[PDB]
Amino acid sequence: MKDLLKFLKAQTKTEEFDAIKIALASPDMIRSWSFGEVKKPETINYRTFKP
């Protein structure tokens, strides 16, 4: 379990590939890689240094 996570991340880093693809990005795809929308130009808070 915890060994299965700990090493699963390690041994699946051996996942391999071939044939680099290239294409154009769609709005739905570009939103696919998005984990969130960056609304605010601020960098860090400066009262606390948590971003």
């Binding site: 680099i20 693809k21 290239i22 990005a25």
Partner: protein, 48 residues
């Protein structure tokens, strides 16, 4: 020697053991170039 993130450590645990070999993997800065191209309106994947 340099680029790979995991290969350097997994190699270091070898050199001291006395088994001279490598588990190369992929250079990390190529994985960076993928994201830098992916920041444009371009998509770049890894097939097969």
């Amino acid at each position: 020697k340099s680029d790979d993130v995991n290969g350097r450590t997994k190699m270091y645990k070898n050199i001291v053991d006395g088994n001279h070999q490598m588990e190369p993997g992929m250079p990390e800065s190529f994985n960076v170039l993928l994201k830098e191209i992916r920041s444009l309106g371009i998509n770049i994947e890894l097939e097969d």
